[PDB]
Amino acid sequence: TNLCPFDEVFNATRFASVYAWNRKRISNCVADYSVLYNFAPFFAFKCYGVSPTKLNDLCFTNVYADSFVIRGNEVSQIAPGQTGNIADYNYKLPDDFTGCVIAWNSNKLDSKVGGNYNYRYRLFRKSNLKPFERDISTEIYQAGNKPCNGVAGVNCYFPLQSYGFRPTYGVGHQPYRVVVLSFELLHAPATVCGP
């Protein structure tokens, strides 16, 4: 039996940024949800639609794991119907979203003295993002009525900003690793099943 590789998802060396969030497809394997209960400190383990107790006896076609790292205070922004910088410009979940959200502390791996600037988010944008939309554009944002000519200056800004994670921060400003499990089953034969 080929057990599904949730290990290479949760136990990765590095995660993805918020504006470029990583997506992994898993299928053609048997999935056990007891192993996922390892890594005892869980900041949040919340599921919508199906229940975690009844998750073991279910079948789907494919599963999609979306992984990234955010600030602690931003965790509550990874739920349906949430508003914020992360939920408006970086990562969006639909209102009818059915799936599981797992957020756990990562202060011991993703925090460096002097600033861990590898994690970035989007601050400015012309409009909001639609559900499951990823934007990696790097165009200059215009806040006035004069062409910027592709150079920053007065009323012309750079959209992407960077987190400064350090170990001495507070719990709310500490990095947190977030993984979202979305289950997709189709009218085709189901493939993802448990024991």
């Epitope: 990583n22 997506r23 992994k24 497809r25 639909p94 993002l129 639609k130 559900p131 499951f132 939309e133 990823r134 990696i136 997709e184 189709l186 009218h187 085709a188």
Partner: antibody
């Protein structure tokens, strides 16, 4: 049992219009989003257009910019493409491909149609 | 945009050999590459998805490998039923770009 069927191809004189349709069965067509790709006779594949799930984000190729229009018909399980100002080298076989759900417009793979063939000659 | 090159453009192998294909990229695309098989007059069929993962209803002889920019595809015990054209495609960003292709002739 997911099936994609393309239709509307044929012969058209240069400088006219033509509409292609892709009919889908076996999934909730209203919230997935779709792609149009084409292959010239004796050449490789060439991506043409993509449309999101609702019908609010549309993306096109530069070589077909200003003449092609992608539309959805969420209800009829059909996706439509409109072609205008057709020129000499637009003869090809067109496939419609299933994408990733919601506004994930960079997904495609194991669900293709059989293709419909379009020529532009006098 | 994104430019990707397939090599070799043509390959010939005997019935009991091993065939390897290469596909490059002009930037880092991570595990966002997939391979297609196309017989003459038929739609492409997905063989390897997400940078070396196997799909349903495929022999175990088909195996991928790669990350970053350069990717490799490999076949195991070759069989007479493996004459087609193989394509690599990226799905990292805007307009999705295919490759030139590789035509495989079985020499007997």
């Amino acid at each position: 049992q997911v099936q994609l069927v393309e239709s509307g191809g044929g012969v058209v004189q240069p400088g006219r219009s033509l509409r292609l349709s892709c009919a889908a069965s076996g999934f909730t067509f209203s919230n997935y989003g779709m792609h149009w790709v084409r292959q010239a006779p004796g050449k490789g594949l060439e991506w043409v257009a993509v449309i999101s799930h609702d019908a609010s984000n549309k993306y096109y190729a530069d070589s077909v910019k200003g003449r092609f229009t992608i539309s959805r018909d969420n209800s009829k399980n059909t996706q439509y493409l409109q072609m205008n100002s057709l020129r000499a080298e637009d003869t090809a076989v067109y496939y419609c491909a299933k994408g990733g759900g919601y506004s994930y417009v960079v997904d495609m793979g194991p669900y293709w149609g059989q293709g419909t063939l379009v020529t532009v000659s006098s | 945009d994104i430019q990707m090159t397939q090599s070799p453009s043509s390959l010939s192998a005997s019935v009991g050999d091993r065939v390897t294909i290469t596909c490059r990229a002009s930037q880092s695309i991570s595990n966002y590459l997939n391979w297609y098989q196309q017989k003459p007059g038929k739609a492409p069929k997905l063989l390897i998805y997400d940078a070396s993962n196997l799909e349903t209803g495929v022999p175990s002889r088909f195996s991928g490998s790669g990350s970053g920019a350069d990717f490799t595809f490999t076949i195991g015990s070759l069989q007479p039923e493996d004459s087609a054209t193989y394509y690599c495609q990226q799905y990292d960003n805007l307009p999705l770009t295919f490759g030139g292709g590789t035509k495989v002739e079985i020499k007997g």
